């Protein structure tokens, strides 16, 4: 329904990805909290930090793409 | 493609909702950090805590519905 639709799909895919990662992040953090042992805690903390960095970068992409799209919606 | 599909759609809708809320949560938290003024900070902190509670409850729903679904996938 337009060329703009391809950009809308990219923004949606980005949000869909951000959501998956945030759910994964909530699951890992709860596991970390509930864990009485050191070895697993420390491995999950490292997966968690990597996820935090990917989520930050994903969110920056969403904001730029939306921002770009709204500025195009003005013209 | 089945009666199970209605349950799959509910789980997807739940994840789609969880993702929206988590993006909203990341945007609010960044605003809070960047804010040099008290009044707005304090209003956003309260929206943020409410979002945290809704996200927790949403995630519990996803885990129970998935858990239920996997236990059904065994039989």
Numbering used by the authors:
A (entry chain A), B (entry chain A): 32 to 106
What does the article say, verbatim?
Located in the inner layer of PCM, Cep57 is a conserved protein in vertebrates that features coiled-coil domains at the N and C termini. Our work elucidates how human PCM protein Cep57 assembles into micron-sized biomolecular condensates through liquid–liquid phase separation by employing various tools in vitro.
To obtain atomic structure information on Cep57, we determined a crystal structure of the Cep57C at 2.10 Å resolution in the space group of P6422. The Cep57C adopts a helix–turn–helix fold, with one protomer in the asymmetric unit, forming a symmetric dimer. The ordered residues span from 354 to 428, with Helix 1 comprising residues 356 to 387, and Helix 2 comprising residues 391 to 427. SEC-MALS data showed that the size of Cep57C-FF mutant decreased to ~17 kDa, indicating it is a mixed population of dimer and monomer. Therefore, Cep57C dimerization is essential to promote Cep57 condensation.
